[PDB]
Write an enzyme that holds these catalytic residues in place. Structure first.
Site, PDB file in Angstrom:
ATOM      1  N   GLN A   2       6.499  14.907 -29.011  1.00  0.00           N
ATOM      2  CA  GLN A   2       7.050  13.891 -29.366  1.00  0.00           C
ATOM      3  C   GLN A   2       7.061  14.167 -30.963  1.00  0.00           C
ATOM      4  O   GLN A   2       5.783  14.389 -31.265  1.00  0.00           O
ATOM      5  CB  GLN A   2       6.735  12.591 -28.953  1.00  0.00           C
ATOM      6  CG  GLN A   2       7.140  11.536 -29.835  1.00  0.00           C
ATOM      7  CD  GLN A   2       7.091  10.234 -29.417  1.00  0.00           C
ATOM      8  OE1 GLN A   2       7.767   9.617 -28.540  1.00  0.00           O
ATOM      9  NE2 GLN A   2       5.739   9.454 -29.461  1.00  0.00           N
ATOM     10  N   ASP A  32      27.667  -1.520 -34.029  1.00  0.00           N
ATOM     11  CA  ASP A  32      28.303   0.157 -34.589  1.00  0.00           C
ATOM     12  C   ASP A  32      29.068   0.661 -33.477  1.00  0.00           C
ATOM     13  O   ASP A  32      29.926  -0.001 -32.904  1.00  0.00           O
ATOM     14  CB  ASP A  32      26.636   0.835 -34.825  1.00  0.00           C
ATOM     15  CG  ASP A  32      26.648   1.967 -35.764  1.00  0.00           C
ATOM     16  OD1 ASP A  32      27.705   2.955 -35.655  1.00  0.00           O
ATOM     17  OD2 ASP A  32      26.097   1.771 -36.664  1.00  0.00           O
ATOM     18  N   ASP A  41      15.872   9.229 -24.376  1.00  0.00           N
ATOM     19  CA  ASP A  41      14.890   8.788 -25.542  1.00  0.00           C
ATOM     20  C   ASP A  41      15.265   7.271 -25.869  1.00  0.00           C
ATOM     21  O   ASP A  41      14.429   6.778 -26.665  1.00  0.00           O
ATOM     22  CB  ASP A  41      14.576   9.415 -26.863  1.00  0.00           C
ATOM     23  CG  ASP A  41      13.428   9.781 -27.322  1.00  0.00           C
ATOM     24  OD1 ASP A  41      12.419   9.421 -26.495  1.00  0.00           O
ATOM     25  OD2 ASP A  41      13.222   9.800 -28.401  1.00  0.00           O
ATOM     26  N   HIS A  64      27.393   7.995 -34.560  1.00  0.00           N
ATOM     27  CA  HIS A  64      26.697   7.214 -35.571  1.00  0.00           C
ATOM     28  C   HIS A  64      25.737   5.951 -34.974  1.00  0.00           C
ATOM     29  O   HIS A  64      24.541   5.924 -35.343  1.00  0.00           O
ATOM     30  CB  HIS A  64      28.083   6.664 -36.253  1.00  0.00           C
ATOM     31  CG  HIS A  64      27.393   5.714 -37.547  1.00  0.00           C
ATOM     32  ND1 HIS A  64      27.433   4.434 -37.723  1.00  0.00           N
ATOM     33  CD2 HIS A  64      26.713   6.238 -38.542  1.00  0.00           C
ATOM     34  CE1 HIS A  64      26.860   3.894 -38.787  1.00  0.00           C
ATOM     35  NE2 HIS A  64      26.549   5.034 -39.520  1.00  0.00           N
ATOM     36  N   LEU A  75      12.313   5.417 -27.661  1.00  0.00           N
ATOM     37  CA  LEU A  75      10.998   5.249 -26.971  1.00  0.00           C
ATOM     38  C   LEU A  75       9.754   5.988 -27.326  1.00  0.00           C
ATOM     39  O   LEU A  75       9.917   7.549 -27.565  1.00  0.00           O
ATOM     40  CB  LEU A  75      11.393   5.406 -25.450  1.00  0.00           C
ATOM     41  CG  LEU A  75      12.530   4.434 -24.933  1.00  0.00           C
ATOM     42  CD1 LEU A  75      13.129   5.066 -23.873  1.00  0.00           C
ATOM     43  CD2 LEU A  75      11.977   3.052 -24.818  1.00  0.00           C
ATOM     44  N   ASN A  77       7.186   8.282 -25.883  1.00  0.00           N
ATOM     45  CA  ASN A  77       6.917   9.011 -24.712  1.00  0.00           C
ATOM     46  C   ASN A  77       6.290  10.334 -25.195  1.00  0.00           C
ATOM     47  O   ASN A  77       5.901  10.850 -26.110  1.00  0.00           O
ATOM     48  CB  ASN A  77       8.181   8.921 -23.903  1.00  0.00           C
ATOM     49  CG  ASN A  77       9.379   9.298 -24.540  1.00  0.00           C
ATOM     50  OD1 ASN A  77       9.529   9.947 -25.580  1.00  0.00           O
ATOM     51  ND2 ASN A  77      10.680   8.742 -23.678  1.00  0.00           N
ATOM     52  N   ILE A  79       8.906  13.026 -25.472  1.00  0.00           N
ATOM     53  CA  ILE A  79       9.753  13.815 -25.792  1.00  0.00           C
ATOM     54  C   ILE A  79      10.657  13.364 -27.114  1.00  0.00           C
ATOM     55  O   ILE A  79      10.333  12.207 -27.590  1.00  0.00           O
ATOM     56  CB  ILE A  79      10.990  14.054 -24.738  1.00  0.00           C
ATOM     57  CG1 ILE A  79      11.484  12.636 -24.057  1.00  0.00           C
ATOM     58  CG2 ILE A  79      10.433  14.720 -23.459  1.00  0.00           C
ATOM     59  CD1 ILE A  79      12.802  12.382 -23.664  1.00  0.00           C
ATOM     60  N   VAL A  81      12.105  11.789 -30.225  1.00  0.00           N
ATOM     61  CA  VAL A  81      11.601  11.029 -31.597  1.00  0.00           C
ATOM     62  C   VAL A  81      10.894   9.874 -31.147  1.00  0.00           C
ATOM     63  O   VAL A  81      10.676   9.365 -30.155  1.00  0.00           O
ATOM     64  CB  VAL A  81      12.874  10.736 -32.771  1.00  0.00           C
ATOM     65  CG1 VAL A  81      13.189  12.152 -33.237  1.00  0.00           C
ATOM     66  CG2 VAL A  81      14.169  10.213 -32.022  1.00  0.00           C
ATOM     67  N   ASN A 155      27.254   3.441 -49.626  1.00  0.00           N
ATOM     68  CA  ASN A 155      26.766   4.722 -50.045  1.00  0.00           C
ATOM     69  C   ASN A 155      27.802   5.056 -51.349  1.00  0.00           C
ATOM     70  O   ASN A 155      28.206   6.136 -51.549  1.00  0.00           O
ATOM     71  CB  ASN A 155      27.221   5.922 -49.245  1.00  0.00           C
ATOM     72  CG  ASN A 155      26.284   5.464 -47.886  1.00  0.00           C
ATOM     73  OD1 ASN A 155      25.113   5.324 -47.841  1.00  0.00           O
ATOM     74  ND2 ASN A 155      26.910   6.125 -46.717  1.00  0.00           N
ATOM     75  N   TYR A 171      26.485 -10.346 -49.402  1.00  0.00           N
ATOM     76  CA  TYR A 171      26.273 -12.063 -49.179  1.00  0.00           C
ATOM     77  C   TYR A 171      24.807 -12.194 -49.286  1.00  0.00           C
ATOM     78  O   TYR A 171      24.130 -11.342 -48.721  1.00  0.00           O
ATOM     79  CB  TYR A 171      26.669 -11.990 -47.722  1.00  0.00           C
ATOM     80  CG  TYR A 171      28.377 -12.054 -47.576  1.00  0.00           C
ATOM     81  CD1 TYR A 171      29.101 -12.457 -48.856  1.00  0.00           C
ATOM     82  CD2 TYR A 171      29.052 -11.481 -46.756  1.00  0.00           C
ATOM     83  CE1 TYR A 171      30.500 -12.643 -48.556  1.00  0.00           C
ATOM     84  CE2 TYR A 171      30.364 -11.212 -46.382  1.00  0.00           C
ATOM     85  CZ  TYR A 171      31.165 -11.859 -47.506  1.00  0.00           C
ATOM     86  OH  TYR A 171      32.635 -12.166 -47.230  1.00  0.00           O
ATOM     87  N   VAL A 174      22.476 -11.669 -46.054  1.00  0.00           N
ATOM     88  CA  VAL A 174      22.109 -10.536 -45.489  1.00  0.00           C
ATOM     89  C   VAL A 174      21.191  -9.723 -46.375  1.00  0.00           C
ATOM     90  O   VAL A 174      21.487  -9.660 -47.468  1.00  0.00           O
ATOM     91  CB  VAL A 174      23.553  -9.589 -45.153  1.00  0.00           C
ATOM     92  CG1 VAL A 174      23.267  -8.495 -44.465  1.00  0.00           C
ATOM     93  CG2 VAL A 174      24.493 -10.721 -44.735  1.00  0.00           C
ATOM     94  N   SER A 221      23.121   4.079 -44.256  1.00  0.00           N
ATOM     95  CA  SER A 221      23.127   3.735 -42.637  1.00  0.00           C
ATOM     96  C   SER A 221      21.893   3.977 -42.048  1.00  0.00           C
ATOM     97  O   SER A 221      21.712   3.470 -40.633  1.00  0.00           O
ATOM     98  CB  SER A 221      24.310   4.384 -41.947  1.00  0.00           C
ATOM     99  OG  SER A 221      25.501   3.928 -42.622  1.00  0.00           O
TER     100      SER A 221
HETATM  101 CA   LIG Z   1      22.735  -9.671 -49.444  1.00  0.00          CA
HETATM  102 CA   LIG Z   2      10.484   9.603 -27.727  1.00  0.00          CA
END
Ligand SMILES: [Ca+2]
Ligand SMILES: [Ca+2]
Length: 275
Positions: A2, A32, A41, A64, A75, A77, A79, A81, A155, A171, A174, A221
């Site tokens: 991992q 998304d 994973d 994406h 997760l 674990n 394996i 990431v 971007n 806004y 956010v 993103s």
């Molecule tokens: Ca804002």
């Molecule tokens: Ca993992």
């Protein structure tokens, strides 16, 4: 085998992980292109699709949504990431299609879905040059309901003396997230403007891809999910905290990098924000 991505270490999440704070029971919606739920994973807890042509929110035709979900909660674990909040209940809210595009009504419909199903955290690694009354109403409604809403600044880079931060990130309600690399320097593509709040790693970010793959992506993103996951880690330590105190904590304990027009309050430090 991992691997912990640099971004998770940069924001100081593994310090909370070792204390027992991994964001258990915090519900995070990844609005998304969907999330690939068959990825070993990722553990997707629920969701809904608002793309009229792609009715399965657990089928990511772009890649994406799966990549963003992995940064949030891949997760812990043996394996692949590790996400920022490995134990968060991940929700796939598909509002973008196979081409990565989505119409506003679909996105707004997804924001409404997250409010009604009580998402503690909304992550929107998307945006556009224009806003609507309805897009502002949806994001303000989520915040009035106790939801922490996080979105990519955009971007667009620099444009003279003006803001290039997109909506809904622009806004006031956010949290707008910009991107920095491993050395804490602003990534050239990161949007700038007075609306920028925080920065998080968004350059060559390794995360989950559909079909039991892993690959690196660059953009705001990829920065946004670090903050959304950091808000979840903070809520796992402080479940009583309102969305306002979570945002206040994240913005007031950042590491200062240059001017706020380019870096907001700076790089998030989830260890300092969680207290
Ligand atoms: Ca804002
Ligand atoms: Ca993992």
């Amino acid at each position: 085998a991992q691997s912990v991505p640099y971004g998770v270490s940069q924001i100081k999440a593994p310090a909370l992980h070792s204390q027992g704070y991994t964001g258990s029971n915090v519900k995070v919606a990844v609005i998304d292109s969907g999330i690939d739920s068959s990825h070993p994973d990722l553990k997707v807890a629920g969701g809904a699709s608002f793309v009229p042509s792609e009715t399965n929110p657990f089928q990511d035709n772009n890649s994406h949504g799966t990549h963003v979900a992995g940064t949030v909660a891949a997760l812990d674990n043996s394996i692949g990431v590790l996400g920022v909040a490995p134990s968060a209940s991940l929700y796939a809210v598909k509002v973008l299609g196979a081409d990565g595009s989505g119409q506003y009504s679909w996105i707004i419909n997804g924001i409404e879905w997250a409010i009604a199903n009580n998402m503690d955290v909304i992550n929107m690694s998307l945006g556009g040059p224009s806003g609507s009354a309805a897009l502002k109403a949806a994001v303000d409604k989520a915040v009035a309901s106790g939801v922490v809403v996080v979105a990519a600044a955009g971007n667009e880079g620099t444009s003279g003396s003006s803001s290039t931060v997109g909506y809904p990130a622009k806004y006031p309600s956010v949290i707008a997230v910009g991107a920095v690399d491993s050395s804490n320097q602003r990534a050239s593509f990161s949007s700038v403007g007075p609306e920028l709040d925080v920065m998080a790693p968004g350059v060559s970010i390794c995360s989950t891809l559909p079909g039991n793959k892993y690959g690196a992506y660059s953009g705001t993103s990829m920065a946004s999910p670090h903050v959304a996951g950091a808000a979840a880690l903070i809520l796992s330590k402080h479940p009583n905290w309102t969305n306002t105190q979570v945002r206040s904590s994240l913005e007031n304990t950042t590491t200062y990098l240059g001017d706020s027009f380019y870096y907001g309050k700076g790089l998030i430090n989830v260890q300092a924000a969680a207290q």
